[PDB]
Design a protein around this ligand. Structure first.
Ligand SMILES: CCOC(=O)c1ccccc1S(=O)(=O)NC(=O)Nc1nc(Cl)cc(OC)n1
Ligand SMILES: CCOC(=O)c1ccccc1S(=O)(=O)NC(=O)Nc1nc(Cl)cc(OC)n1
Lengths: 349, 349
């Protein structure tokens, strides 16, 4: 059912700073080609979209895309089925979707000169990085190798091109400045729930430690674990005995403790191996990363928290990729999110 | 005024091509840091958003942002009032809003290496260009100089930060590929009307010559004129006696003649001087640019066309900037668009 009734919708920019070129702006001189002379540039701002239902219930949801993605992934699946934006406006929540600084409609900080360079200052690096289709195929666990699907896959087959077209690079904006923009959004919104994904998992945890308005977190397949400073547990290398997962983020314990004050759920899909898998690097990477997250959640619970790990196969859902919210069974995944919101009173006024 | 009822909404990717790095992808080797080895990259694809009302009447509208912009400018004004997307869904049209290749949720083609470079191939230039706040202020005719406003201005004063935060750079993707993506969209949708702005003006004219499904064009402040090959009239240089306007685009007469088969309206706001203005480059640029457009429309009409120029002040609207659809009087600007659609039956089934 695709119908949606909105009390209001719109979008806006929030956060960011400015940087300035040298010299002066003279309106009598040719303005094009564009010049850094007398220039003021707005950089690192974030794009925010909102859709509000009639008679909302409970807290607004802020959907935060994963690495190299945009708010598109909450709008529609690659095969054109409704995304979580539609599903949760229908579930009577106001829904915010963002494009974080450096992605989509967020700002890409570049000027007149080599990419990212403002005269002699490097605002972001000129050299970029970006996953290939092949790297994303195995990262997202469509299958063990590019072009191959797990038998049980919930991926919308036949729409591979549509899916990979949604992905791209991120300039080297500091994570601090990305967190700063979302903290400012949370200040503007009021009490809310963060729904994060992959690379935004660790960022949403950080935002919660700076923003008491975050009243709950649901993180789909978070990519980087978080621990109190100096208390990172033993985490093994990968099966190739040379690689490691992402270095866990460490925060002051007084900030980490704020994570124990709200309900937190990490959600993982299927086909993460239980045993070392040296033939398939990213499958093994997910094995050890999920393990590190289990230890992170345990650390929160030992501070009095309520942090849980939901493996979708234990709930009866088999074959999900790293994007469970755009898989073929995304309505069932959404139902589990509604269950979490209902258990914790986040769907009541 | 804010309530919107959607039979369906969503977004999707369309257009683009693929490029590749050397070698083969091995899933047992570390996938991160990302590599060009064995890589397939999707590049130059376009993001498309659609909102459809219950029981649409007439043709879908395709809103195409100007230079360095995104579909945000059709969603909301800088001060948060409804944009043309909401207004025309309420006016019973299905509305498509795009982020063209190179902008917003469209693809920015870059890889592992210096910006835009895939091994030894330069997909897009590493050196970028980007307007300052000051350049944009005078380009968009907020006032003759940064910080100043024209009398009776319709700009949402006080929301300059929001406004300028929506602007950014565009990589050097060829115009051919941008036009290609929209031609593909037009085929997918079927008969439609293109509503363009500034830089997308000339591109929309080109799309229409390649796509019969374009049944009408409304262009807000187009930046580049279009003429038949070898038939560009004499265009005076600017008052500084050194600058000129954008070199007019020239196409084969066969293609140019297609523009005479559909209704076309160019819409201009206020404060474009009638006489030479050497002290204000962009004001003078706009004077001669509008003059060139008048001759372009004359050429279309001499081939049997239905082309017209609408100056908002003559319609009773004073103070508009180069973004009349986000100005304080944008509802009145929308009414004039509805009038054009009604005159040509483009609001009827
Ligand atoms: C599903 C969309 O993709 C992701 O978010 C994702 C998922 C798993 C692993 C890495 C990423 S990532 O590419 O975004 N990377 C990161 O999460 N951050 C990151 N951290 C480190 Cl230490 C290195 C690195 O290199 C690209 N990248
Ligand atoms: C409202 C956003 O601003 C515009 O769309 C706009 C308006 C007037 C002039 C130029 C642009 S532009 O910067 O987008 N540029 C172009 O339209 N194209 C363009 N053509 C040429 Cl031959 C040169 C050039 O240099 C920046 N740029």
């Amino acid at each position: 059912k695709r119908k949606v009734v909105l009390a209001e919708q719109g979008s806006f920019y929030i956060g960011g700073r400015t940087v300035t070129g040298p010299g002066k702006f003279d309106p009598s001189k040719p303005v094009i080609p564009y010049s850094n002379e007398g220039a003021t540039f707005y950089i690192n701002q974030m794009y925010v979209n909102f859709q509000a239902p009639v008679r909302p219930r409970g807290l607004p949801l802020v959907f935060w895309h994963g690495g190299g993605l945009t708010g598109h992934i909450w709008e529609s699946t690659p095969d054109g089925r409704p995304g979580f934006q539609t599903l949760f406006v229908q579930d009577r929540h106001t829904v915010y979707t963002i494009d974080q600084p450096g992605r989509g409609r967020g700002n890409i900080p570049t000027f007149n000169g080599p990419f990212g360079q403002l005269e002699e200052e490097s605002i972001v690096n000129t050299v970029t990085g970006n996953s290939s289709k092949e790297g994303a195929w195995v990262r997202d666990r469509l299958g063990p190798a590019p072009g191959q699907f797990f038998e049980n896959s919930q991926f919308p087959r036949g729409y591979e091109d549509n899916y990979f077209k949604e992905m791209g690079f991120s300039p080297s904006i500091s994570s601090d400045e990305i967190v700063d923009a979302v903290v400012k959004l949370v200040t503007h919104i009021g009490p809310c729930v963060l729904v994060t994904h992959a690379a935004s998992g660790v960022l949403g945890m950080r935002v919660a430690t700076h923003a008491k308005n975050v009243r709950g977190i649901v993180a789909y397949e978070p990519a980087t674990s978080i621990f109190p400073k100096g208390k990172v547990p033993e985490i093994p290398p990968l099966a190739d005995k040379k690689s490691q997962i992402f270095p866990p983020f460490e925060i002051q314990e007084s900030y980490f403790k704020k994570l124990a004050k709200i309900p937190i759920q990490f959600v993982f899909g299927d086909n993460i191996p239980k045993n070392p898998k040296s033939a398939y690097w990213f499958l093994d990477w997910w094995r050890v990363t999920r393990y590190a997250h289990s230890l992170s959640l345990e650390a929160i619970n030992k501070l009095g928290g309520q942090a849980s790990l939901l493996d979708l196969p234990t709930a009866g859902l088999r074959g999900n990729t790293a994007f469970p919210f755009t898989d073929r069974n995304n309505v069932q995944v959404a139902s589990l999110l509604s269950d979490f919101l209902g258990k914790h009173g986040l769907d009541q006024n």
